[PDB]
Amino acid sequence: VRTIKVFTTVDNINLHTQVVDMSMTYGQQFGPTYLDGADVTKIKPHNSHEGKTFYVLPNDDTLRVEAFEYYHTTDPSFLGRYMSALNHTKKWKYPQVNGLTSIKWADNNCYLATALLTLQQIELKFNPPALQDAYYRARAGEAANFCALILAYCNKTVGELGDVRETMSYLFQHANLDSCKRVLNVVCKTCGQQQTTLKGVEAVMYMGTLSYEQFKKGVQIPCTCGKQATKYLVQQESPFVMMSAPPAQYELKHGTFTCASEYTGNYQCGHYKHITSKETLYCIDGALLTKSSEYKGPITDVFYKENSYTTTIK
Amino acid sequence: KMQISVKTLMRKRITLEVEPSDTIENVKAKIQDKEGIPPDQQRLIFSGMLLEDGRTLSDYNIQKGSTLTLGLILR
Amino acid sequence: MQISVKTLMRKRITLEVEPSDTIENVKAKIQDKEGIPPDQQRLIFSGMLLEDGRTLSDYNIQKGSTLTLGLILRA
Ligand SMILES: [Br-]
Ligand SMILES: [Br-]
Ligand SMILES: [Zn+2]
């Protein structure tokens, strides 16, 4: 019986030694088997393989815990999705533009460009070790693994067009948002006021205005009487804040934000561009970079940097 | 001097003695006495099944000599 | 009866190293402290397998950084 020594893993941190017969396909002995992107489930082992490392779906409980303490997921179809999409992101190119790692356009990856470029500008620390060791690699110019995790954590397929407002919602639930707390207050002319205090993922995300400066002043919402309420930010403790709104012509001013995203396109078919406030407004379109003095455009998401704020509204 | 720190996933093998009618809460408590890991920070896995904290060994068809895998929830 | 549960717990150990020691030297620092032999030792830092002929500096392993240790399991 002709055999060779090869390693199975689920995290590419802990390797399990395996001896394989050169008659049966990989999928017969290991189950679904991927080798650094390539689905080798239905193929027989070749002589060149000895010493390599293969990715396998977790079949034994020793692997479930190994792939749970690194990907932080219980889903059986995660490595199937991570590895199915990492084969494509490894074929992409990640141009370093304006001291930032972007993604050259391919397979409608527009949203992953702005998402990845925004992450290098705001303060985020990921809780999963898979994101922990793949973001590190992403900031060094090679984000092949990083964009695959995002395509699995958001359950999107390579080619499936995506949304930046929603795509960043999944990363934030897998990020260290514990000391983040937002207290809002709502005031109706006839009901008085109610104070709401929310902590975590919802203390950095808001949909209803892109101007943070307005959030302190107030935005108007329907009341439980039939009348108008006024909601405003009382206190905010967080390294940053995300303000988002449906795409619309908004004017961005230098040093007023940290970075933003633009949605130039039609409903359910579009394209994302990234605007960042360096010395002068830079518009990062993946692998193309164009600067301008002012930026008036269809901006949908705006990111502001924060440390701690207390409202001045007595 | 320098203060480098390494993250580990140490592996071990322990031998519990139980009656095939105890609960995972009872099994989780045997781990605490035998190793010191609290039952609240204890996650048990058997053939893909997260061991519920109130089910008994039989409700999961545990054998004699069949080996479970213990992890701890992220804390 | 006579049931065995395998334990794979997470730990975090703190080595004392100089920013010019080799991965052979760092791997051995695990050995005296925990007992995992250097041949069964795989270490990763910032998404990068630490080769057995590079010094810490070749990775910018500054004072305070977190490494990840993996194990070449057998069977
Ligand atoms: Br009204
Ligand atoms: Br590497
Ligand atoms: Zn009202």
Residue numbers in the entry:
A (entry chain B): 2 to 315
B (entry chain G): 0 to 74
C (entry chain F): 1 to 75
Sentences from the paper on this structure:
A promising drug target common to all coronaviruses—including SARS-CoV, MERS-CoV, and SARS-CoV-2—is the papain-like protease (PLpro). PLpro cleaves part of the viral replicase polyproteins into non-structural protein subunits, which are essential to the viral replication cycle. Additionally, PLpro can cleave both ubiquitin and the ubiquitin-like protein ISG15 from host cell substrates as a mechanism to evade innate immune responses during infection. Here we demonstrate that ubiquitin variants (UbVs) can be selected from a phage-displayed library and used to specifically and potently block SARS-CoV-2 PLpro activity.
